[PDB]
Structure 1
Amino acid sequence: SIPALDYNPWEAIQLPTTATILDMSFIDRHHGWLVGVNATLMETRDGGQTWEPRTLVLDHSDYRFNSVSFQGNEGWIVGEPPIMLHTTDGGQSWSQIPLDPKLPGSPRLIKALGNGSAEMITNVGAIYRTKDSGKNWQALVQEAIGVMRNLNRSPSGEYVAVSSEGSFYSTWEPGQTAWEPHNETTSEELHNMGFTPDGRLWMIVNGGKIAFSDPDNSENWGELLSPLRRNSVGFLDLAYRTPNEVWLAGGAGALLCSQDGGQTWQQDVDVKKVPSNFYKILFFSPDQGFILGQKGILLRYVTDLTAAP
């Protein structure tokens, strides 16, 4: 079995809820919001150590809040069935923005660009942009691609979308008028994909394997790596805290850390006790990170008091 990690930086926090949390975003170091199932909406003022519920005046509370994104005090929330909320004062007040009924599918992701601009993607891949605080939306891609298994965004605004059956993945970048399908890269079933901090792609495929794209050609993939060397445990999300430290979350309390960019892995055994699947990792800076779970449990990253840099 792989070596145990020396320090466990992940602290469990019980939110005042049992809803599953789906996304999180910070205005600044201390002031942030998280969202989830059942119109769950909570605020922190102390960097995510403590969270306060916020109730919205909605027509109903069955909304699934999928995505929250801030740029400064300007913030956006989208969910299903189609709903979009906007704030200009860091969430002190939230306004509902009417969506076009002709929107194909429901909003899955929203990205605040600041100064009234935002980009939104539906769960079938329609991409819309606003420059006027949501009054008007330009369609950047209307040719839908079907339900996505996972969707991630690069720093330069590229998107990668895993197809519904994991048979392929699709990419899009500003300028393109349709998603680009990428077929037969792997013989394995794709689960999740995203971007590294050096401009490569990563993928999790079913069976607990991962791979990184070739820096010479993002169409080509390196060897399938098995972080645990056993096929038994599948992974759900991968995220970098720094260019070299990668965290990988999976089923059955699996949480692995690599300090060399994903070649060698150690296991965080202290979190096997925590009763939640770890479905999503978010780092906001090298000292601020969260692992999103079920039953209102949230892991918070706590920097090592004996590590110097």
Structure 2
Amino acid sequence: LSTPALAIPALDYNPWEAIQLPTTATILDMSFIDRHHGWLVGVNATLMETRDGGQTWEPRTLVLDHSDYRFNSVSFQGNEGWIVGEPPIMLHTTDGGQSWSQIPLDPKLPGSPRLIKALGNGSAEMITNVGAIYRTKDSGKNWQALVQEAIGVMRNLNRSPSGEYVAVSSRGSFYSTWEPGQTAWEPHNRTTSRRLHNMGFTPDGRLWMIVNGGKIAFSDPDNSENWGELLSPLRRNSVGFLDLAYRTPNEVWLAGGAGALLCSQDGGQTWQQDVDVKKVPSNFYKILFFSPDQGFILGQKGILLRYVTD
């Protein structure tokens, strides 16, 4: 017993600085106009703006009919930005969020908005909480239905660079994929007994999954429906993971409950723990990298971690 028992090695540098936002509401999403100017959104109609790359954030309160909205998603492409939330709401800007307008949503939308993606120049795509997919090309005046066959309330949803999506079923029994041209989601059975929690895309054309009990896997490069070995980054089942994101093609971060944050420098094969952030009293729900030297992790109760290059 000459090395610490049951642990994984501790990372040599902690790049994450903890920030307390001027709120205790949960933050759900973030998007940048450029390197310095960006927006974040969350629960209770929370909206904040940064002009310094996300070091400091200023609350903005829109005078809406009520403040119970859960702002689920924000997306900018240059100065054009969009926010969606539940109960159904859509906000739009063309000036970097200096003025926002509410876009009326068709009451026949199946489910409430879950995700919006700005495509620039008046175009955007929206997905509802039950997987209906719509696109606008005219700044939200008209929406074309791409998928109307609903799939139940998705547990998680992620997008690839080419506009594919992957959605985990409500209770993690299976997952579904969609790409442009398809008229419905395609279901795929899970490949572990443990239920799926989250799935997304790697920067090399594969899928990743997080499953119950702190395990992860990656799809086969030759066949995205074949899956590799089930990995245990923390060598245990007690700590669940919530999100996985790549800073670079080889450097991967894995965020989970109760201060858990791990990094792999070999593409996800082996992991080391960022022990400094174990002191932060928060689950780490979402990792957002905007470039290799700008990134954020969403905690609870207004906690943010901000990436600071060594």
**TM-score, with structure 1 as normaliser:** 0.98
Q: Any idea what SS the aligned residue of 2:29 has?
A: strand
Which whole-Å deviations, capped at 9, do the CAs of 1:150-185 have from their partners, x for residues lacking one?
A: 000000000000000100000000000000000143
Which whole-Å deviations, capped at 9, do the CAs of 1:135-161 have from their partners, x for residues lacking one?
A: 000000000000000000000000000
Which whole-Å deviations, capped at 9, do the CAs of 1:77-126 have from their partners, x for residues lacking one?
A: 00000000000000000000000000000000000000000000000000
Q: Which residue does the alignment assign to 2:120?
A: 114
The 8 Å contact of residues 175 and 190 in structure 2, kept in 1 or not, is answered as no
The CA deviation at 1:57 is 1.4
Unpaired runs of 5+ residues, structure 2, are 1-6
Which whole-Å deviations, capped at 9, do the CAs of 1:203-246 have from their partners, x for residues lacking one?
A: 00001110000000000000100011111111000000000000
The 8 Å contact of residues 70 and 112 in structure 1, kept in 2 or not, is answered as yes
The 8 Å contact of residues 158 and 173 in structure 1, kept in 2 or not, is answered as yes
Q: Any idea what SS the aligned residue of 2:296 has?
A: strand
**For this pair of structures, how many residues does the alignment match?**
304
The 8 Å contact of residues 185 and 219 in structure 1, kept in 2 or not, is answered as no
Q: Indicate which of 171, 174, 182 corresponds to 2:180.
A: 174
The CA deviation at 1:276 is 1.1
Which whole-Å deviations, capped at 9, do the CAs of 1:232-272 have from their partners, x for residues lacking one?
A: 11100000000000000011111000000000100001001
Mapped to 2, the partners of 1:126 and 1:185 lie a distance apart of 25
Which moved further from structure 2: 120-129 or 228-237? 228-237
Q: Which residue does the alignment assign to 1:300?
A: 306
The CA deviation at 1:295 is 1.1
Q: Any idea what SS the aligned residue of 2:276 has?
A: helix
C-alpha root-mean-square deviation of aligned residues, in Å? 0.5
The 8 Å contact of residues 16 and 53 in structure 1, kept in 2 or not, is answered as yes
Mapped to 2, the partners of 1:142 and 1:277 lie a distance apart of 34
Which whole-Å deviations, capped at 9, do the CAs of 1:44-69 have from their partners, x for residues lacking one?
A: 00000000000101000000000000
Which moved further from structure 2: 271-280 or 190-199? 271-280
Mapped to 2, the partners of 1:224 and 1:129 lie a distance apart of 37
Q: Any idea what SS the aligned residue of 1:112 has?
A: strand
Mapped to 1, the partners of 2:80 and 2:190 lie a distance apart of 41
**TM-score, with structure 2 as normaliser:** 0.97
The 8 Å contact of residues 196 and 202 in structure 1, kept in 2 or not, is answered as yes
The CA deviation at 1:186 is 2.7
The 8 Å contact of residues 190 and 196 in structure 2, kept in 1 or not, is answered as no
The 8 Å contact of residues 208 and 227 in structure 1, kept in 2 or not, is answered as yes
The CA deviation at 1:187 is 2.3
Unpaired runs of 5+ residues, structure 1, are 305-309
The CA deviation at 1:293 is 1.1
Q: Any idea what SS the aligned residue of 1:271 has?
A: helix
Mapped to 2, the partners of 1:17 and 1:251 lie a distance apart of 21
Mapped to 1, the partners of 2:247 and 2:35 lie a distance apart of 16
Which moved further from structure 2: 101-110 or 224-233? 224-233
Mapped to 2, the partners of 1:29 and 1:184 lie a distance apart of 38
Mapped to 1, the partners of 2:191 and 2:276 lie a distance apart of 36
Q: Which residue does the alignment assign to 2:197?
A: 191
| 1:76 and 2:117 matched | no
The 8 Å contact of residues 27 and 300 in structure 2, kept in 1 or not, is answered as yes
Percent identity reads 98
